[PDB]
Design a protein around this ligand. Structure first.
Ligand SMILES: O=C(O)c1csc(Cc2cccc(Cl)c2)n1
Length: 133
């Protein structure tokens, strides 16, 4: 019952600062433009201790499966090869990515009927809001 309130199909309804977040991460111009136009659906499911997060859009379809607190290797939609760990901290899913001596954190929280995604790297934050599909 770990993530019950996150499970479901979610659609992007708003974004702020995502281009600048992507610049900070190191994403190149063409990828930023196409990725920034995407309107992904995020599909979260749980089977036993394994959580699966899928993101589907015209830009890219991604899927990660993981156990909380157990590191895994991830190829991000922008083609970084990162080492990721996802934990629950006070009801917030905290997804940390480490690569090339750098780090970024993606937090996912339930707030009212929304799922709010906050992405941070070195003072650059982006907030992306999803609603149930
Ligand atoms: O709400 C989302 O769609 C989301 C937040 S963070 C992330 C992962 C990422 C970072 C930089 C470039 C790209 Cl294309 C993807 N995807």
């Amino acid at each position: 019952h770990m993530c019950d309130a996150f499970v479901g199909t979610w659609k992007l309804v708003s974004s702020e600062n995502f281009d600048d977040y992507m610049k900070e991460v190191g994403v190149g111009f063409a990828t930023r433009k196409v990725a920034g136009m995407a309107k992904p659906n995020m599909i979260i499911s749980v089977n036993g201790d394994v959580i699966t997060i899928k993101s589907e859009s015209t830009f890219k379809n991604t899927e990660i499966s993981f156990i909380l607190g157990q590191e895994f290797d991830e190829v991000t939609a922008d083609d970084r090869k990162v080492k990721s760990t996802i934990t629950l901290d006070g009801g917030v899913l905290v997804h940390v990515q480490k690569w090339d001596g750098k780090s970024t954190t993606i937090k996912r929280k339930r707030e009212d009927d929304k799922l709010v995604v906050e992405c941070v790297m070195k003072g650059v934050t982006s907030t992306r809001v999803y609603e149930r599909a």
